[PDB]
Amino acid sequence: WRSEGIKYRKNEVFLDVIEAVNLLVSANGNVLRSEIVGSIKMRVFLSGMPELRLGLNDKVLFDNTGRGKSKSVELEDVKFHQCVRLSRFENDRTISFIPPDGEFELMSYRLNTHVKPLIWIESVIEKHSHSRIEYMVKAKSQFKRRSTANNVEIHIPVPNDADSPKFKTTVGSVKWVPENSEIVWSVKSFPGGKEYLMRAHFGLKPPISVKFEIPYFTTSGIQVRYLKIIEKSGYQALPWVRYITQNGDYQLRTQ
Amino acid sequence: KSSVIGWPAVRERMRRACAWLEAQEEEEVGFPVTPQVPLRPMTYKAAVDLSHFLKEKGGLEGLIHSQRRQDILDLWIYHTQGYFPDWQNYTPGPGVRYPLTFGWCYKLVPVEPDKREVLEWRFDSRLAFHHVARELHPEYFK
């Protein structure tokens, strides 16, 4: 937390708004669980003993300010780092704090949505008993064309005794991991609004899971509208901000 | 400033705005951000400046306000000038609706013979020096 006497040649703050997409899709193709779990993570480098305020586009805040008719974020299960004054949040919606030095996490929130999953996965599966098995999987990116997921990993279970793997895919790379009884399809760069295909068969129950990161993106529409800084000295200080979406817990059931 | 003169294309759109069906669009998820570009709330200076460009080139004055029309303006400014589209809110009726954004020189006045109530954008420079919304409703401010 804060101490006195801090000093920098340059005063700045960075905010990382990070959203983690939770997913459970039942085997059938119907969605059990869709959830966003976010946090705001801050690197602070501020001399002296400043005073911070965080404007978000916060449904309530807008509702109370005659700005209700605007697009906002109605954001649940909000919990704050310690230094945040609640007496102010309780009444105003105001996020008011004296920030620690450097890295620390300012707040967390949750959202519920039924909205197209960012990455959709169908795997069809043809098994010939005691003989061979076949996997036809299709990955589809359902987020905006002009964004791009990174380091996407699709993890699909194959049977603990399968052998002799073979696969083809137009995009990415597939590998066998016997120790986890899974195959792993890795696409390094995954543009939005696209369908990719990978084929796999072997020879002769946990969910399909995916991992992805999307920079310059959020699924919640959360804007950090401004960050106010007051310190007694005439202070030149700049806030910086980015948004990052990532998977957290994201799974398609299989059976 | 010349891309500020992609306004006719916006103004154009702003205007003209056993059964038939809406073609539901296929929605793409998420809210992208363009990489280093600063997004900020609307400013007194910009709101004043925008205001005036608009009263000159025309099309806003006495056009009839629907939220649909409003929104096309806001997105335009959001995409070209990078101001979050929360600023063009007005004070509630009935009556004349006042800008909540000090510096925005348009208000919503009702009107009868030409036809809840119907309104039009109307320009008022007094809105620039007199924050009517704030005194009508300091509850919204600080």
Binding site: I18 | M42, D86, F141
Partner: peptide, 19 residues
């Protein structure tokens, strides 16, 4: 080109409403 992407500068007040 960095990390989880590049930062954009942010505003210091709600110029929309007072300041």
């Amino acid at each position: 080109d960095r990390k989880g992407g590049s930062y954009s500068q942010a505003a210091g007040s709600d110029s929309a409403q007072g300041s």
